[PDB]
Amino acid sequence: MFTPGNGPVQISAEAIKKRVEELGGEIARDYQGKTPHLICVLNGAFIFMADLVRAIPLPLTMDFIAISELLKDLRLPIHGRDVIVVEDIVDTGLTLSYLLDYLEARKPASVRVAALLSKPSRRQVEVPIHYLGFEIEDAYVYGYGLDRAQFDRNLPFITSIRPE
Amino acid sequence: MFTPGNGPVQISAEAIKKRVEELGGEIARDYQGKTPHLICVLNGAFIFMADLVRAIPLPLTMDFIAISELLKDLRLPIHGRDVIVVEDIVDTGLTLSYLLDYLEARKPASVRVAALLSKPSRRQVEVPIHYLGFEIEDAYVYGYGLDRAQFDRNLPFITSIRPE
Numbered sequence A, B: 001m002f003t004p005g006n007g008p009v010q011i012s013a014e015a016i017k018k019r020v021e022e023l024g025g026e027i028a029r030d031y032q033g034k035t036p037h038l039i040c041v042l043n044g045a046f047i048f049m050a051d052l053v054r055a056i057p058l059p060l061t062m063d064f065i066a067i068s069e070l071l072k073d074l075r076l077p078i079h080g081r082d083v084i085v086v087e088d089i090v091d092t093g094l095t096l097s098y099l100l101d102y103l104e105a106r107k108p109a110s111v112r113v114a115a116l117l118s119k120p121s122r123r124q125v126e127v128p129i130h131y132l133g134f135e136i137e138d139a140y141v142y143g144y145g146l147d148r149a150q151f152d153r154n155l156p157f158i159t160s161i162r163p164e
């Protein structure tokens, strides 16, 4: 009974699957000979993370963190590691900006960002996104891990509501 | 370059996909008219969780917890909710046993368990598993979210090593 909202942004499970596989392939190529450490930003990015890692045929480690201050700390060391932050959607960029400064403080070998979506018209602070799934217009999206008042994270596709 | 180990347990991505879809269907049927709250036990169950929820066409909420004592607490209320714990693999059952007592203490409306795997020959404490993916022989498995010294969680299939 998965039903799309009536918003302007709509991305099918098929379109998402293909893009994620493409991103995984790019990462595998860019990180050949390396062992990246992917950090999933909970809760929204967990499905993107699950699909993305399965498309990266390289030896790698993972960790999970919650941010909003951080509600969940890192468990594995990141110093000297080639880190890849996995985000759901970059809106104003404030959260990612804070996260990047936090991670850089531990002196990782490098840090790149993978994000399923980005709403650049809302950007308040410039943050990098090396692996972007889709650039979209300003709209509240949900599904594929992203919530609407805690619900709808289970929709296999990305949908949205009207600003109304 | 995803390569299987030489252990006795081997489960393909295809076999896993079909089983997870079956489990999701059962849950959707069993919980018709309800709004379950699925709690993913990190880190191992995150991929099973990602695939499972996308196979449950019902309105539902989610949360994530880390256990080993708990390393990550619950954020959403569970009192009066129909809770479904999502685990990666039940070995001795000690962890799940502790988790169930913890959750029951908050008086949820009900609690059921979904687990991808179970090694019953290792069971030290009897714990319920209402939605089980596969019952397997005693072996150390990895892949599909489960790690081998933090690595191999990204394998799209379940594999194993030899006890040797």
Ligand SMILES: O=c1[nH]cnc2c1ncn2[C@@H]1O[C@H](COP(=O)(O)O)[C@@H](O)[C@H]1O
Pocket (backbone or CB within 6 Å): A044, A087, A088, A089, A090, A091, A092, A093, A094, A095, A096, A139, A140, A141, A142, A146, A147
């Ligand atoms: O359109 C949306 N749908 C769902 N969540 C969103 C949306 N926009 C922003 N968020 C959440 O806000 C968090 C940080 O947003 P930011 O700090 O403004 O870039 C993201 O990681 C999302 O969890």
Ligand SMILES: O=c1[nH]cnc2c1ncn2[C@@H]1O[C@H](COP(=O)(O)O)[C@@H](O)[C@H]1O
Pocket (backbone or CB within 6 Å): B044, B087, B088, B089, B090, B091, B092, B093, B094, B095, B096, B139, B140, B141, B142, B146, B147
């Ligand atoms: O064969 C295995 N492979 C990977 N992890 C395992 C295996 N067996 C047990 N575990 C981990 O041990 C945790 C709890 O095991 P238990 O308390 O003995 O039932 C599970 O949630 C897994 O994360």
